[PDB]
Structures are given as C-alpha cells and as structure tokens.
Amino acid sequence: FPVPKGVLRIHFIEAQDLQGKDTYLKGLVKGKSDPYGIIRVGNQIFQSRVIKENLSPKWNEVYEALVYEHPGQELEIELFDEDPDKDDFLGSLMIDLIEVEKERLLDEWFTLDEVPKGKLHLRLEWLTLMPNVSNLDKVLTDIKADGLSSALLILYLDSARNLPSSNPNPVVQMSVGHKAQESKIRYKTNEPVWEENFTFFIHNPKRQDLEVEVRDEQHQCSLGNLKVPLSQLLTSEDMTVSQRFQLSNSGPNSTIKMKIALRVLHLEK
Ligand SMILES: [Ca+2]
Ligand SMILES: [Ca+2]
Ligand SMILES: [Ca+2]
C-alpha cells in the first residue's frame, strides 16, 4: 500500500487585479465578478467560497492535501466567476510539487496564465511525516492549539473475529472526530477480512479519540464498537500500535485487528 511522501498545506489567501466578467444593462456597463477557486492535488479537490463583486478577493482559506511519490504530481488551480449559467474563467496556475518539496516554504504572488491580467497570493507549506513524537509539542504551538492538522492518522483494518450473529454482513466505520470513512462490506460472515488502509487528518492527538463502529449493513443492528484515545499512541514506538482490540456492546470474544500509526506534520528548512 502507498504511503504519503508528505502533506501540502495550501493557504488560499487572495488574488488581485482579476478579469471582470459580468455586465449590467444588456452589457452596456462593464462590471466586476464573483471569484472563487478550484484547487486540485491528485484526486483531492478543493473549492473556495464565492466572494461577490470584487477583483481583489480575500479568501484566507486553507486546505490540506496528501502527496505521494507518484509521477510528476502537480498542484492545479483554476479561478472562476460565479455566474448563474456557465462560470466564466478567471485564470489558471500549475505548480510542480517536486519543486515545492525542495523549497519547503513559499510565500509568493503568481501571475495567472491564459488571462490578460490577474495575480494570486499563495503560501505553501510542505509538511513531512515524522515518526517520532519529538516535535509534536512545537507543531501544536505553531498551529496555536487552544483548526488545521498537527498530525496524520494512518490505520490499517485487518480483520475482526467472532462477531455477534442467523449470520451478519459486517462493515466497519471509523471516525476520528468529525471526519468519517467506511471500509468495504463482507457478506454473511462473523470473521471478516478487509485488509484496507485509511488516512485521517488530526488537529490535536492529545484531545481526539478514534471511534470505531462495526455494523451489519443489511440491518440497523450494531456489531460492536471501540474507542482509542490517540494520546495512547503518543507513548508507543514510532507512535504506532498494532494489536487485537476488544469490542464493546459486542460478544465477549469479539475483537478487531488493526495497525494504527501517527505521524507529526513538520515543516523544516
Ligand atoms: Ca460573468
Ligand atoms: Ca458573476
Ligand atoms: Ca453557474
């Protein structure tokens, strides 16, 4: 299974001098526009807010994208005017990631291509995955923890044993805080195998819990659940634990096997 080469934190700050594409009164009066941006990294897509009637938009939004050692992967950005029909094009940008890794931290205005005018203000942070916990304390403080992610949670769903029944069709749902993802379904078995990998962004591992619920997908019935304070990982080697876990609201011998690893996101120079 692929593992991330790092995390790219994208500050979608502002743009200036964009192309006005709206016109009042049958096109007599030249007007401004309603800019917003579409940001792409690999399969990950991000959409900024629409700011109305302004060619120097200030979004101050921030997105977090996973980056792997895959070929030539790039940061793609397109700006549009929100119109009631087809949104008019306000310019585009293409940044080489392998270049961004090299610089670690950028703060620059970029001139949009394929438009007569327009500039975009970005601050890019290349965060690497740290296996030791040595810098968590510093990363939490820089974020100003009192939000964006201070860590990643990478977890492996191996299998479960001896689940309650008649037989069920087991599926697992994991949700660190509000982010939630689901495994695939196994059918008519009390011994499911998934061998699936999942990744979650983490604001603060000292506060957040991983919640795991096993369900029978056919029927509303629950098959057990599990809470794992991520803090417990903080005291494990390479912030990774691998064991069988007891399920609650389940059988007495019902368990779930996982590998769970934490990585602190760090900007170095
Ligand atoms: Ca328009
Ligand atoms: Ca418009
Ligand atoms: Ca539209």
Quaternary status: monomer
User: Under the CATH scheme, which architecture of the largest domain would be assigned?
Assistant: Sandwich
| Strand content range | over 45%
Q: How many helices?
A: 2
- Elements, N to C (H/E): EEEEEEEEHEEHEEEEEEEE
- Portion of residues within helices: under 10%
Total number of distinct structural domains? 2
**Shape verdict:** elongated
| Bound small-molecule species | calcium ion
Briefly note the CATH topology name of the largest domain.
Immunoglobulin-like
PDB class: membrane protein
Keywords: calcium/phospholipid binding protein, C2 domain, ER to plasma membrane, membrane traffic, protein targeting, Plasma membrane, membrane protein
Assembly: monomeric
Entry title: Extended-Synaptotagmin 2, C2A- and C2B-domains, calcium bound
Which features characterize this protein?
monomer; 269 residues; mainly beta; Immunoglobulin-like; four-stranded antiparallel β-sheet; 18 strands; 6% helix; 50% strand; binds calcium ion
Please give a structural write-up:
The chain is mostly beta strands and 269 residues long. It has two domains: 143 residues, C2 domain (Immunoglobulin-like), CATH 2.60.40.150; 126 residues, C2 domain (Immunoglobulin-like). It is 6% helix and 50% strand. It has two helices and 18 strands. The strands form four sheets. Strands 1, 6, 9, 10, 11, 14, 17 and 18 form an eight-stranded antiparallel β-sheet that branches. Strands 5-4-7-8 form a four-stranded antiparallel β-sheet. It has a four-stranded antiparallel β-sheet with strand order 13-12-15-16, with no helix packed on it. A hairpin with a 6-residue loop joins strand 12 and strand 13. The two termini are 29 Å apart. It binds calcium ion (CA) (3 copies). One calcium ion (CA) binds next to loops. Belongs to the extended synaptotagmin family. Homodimer. Interacts with ESYT1 and ESYT3. Interacts with FGFR1 that has been activated by FGF1 binding. Interacts with the AP-2 complex; identified in a complex with the AP-2 complex and FGFR1. This is Extended synaptotagmin-2.
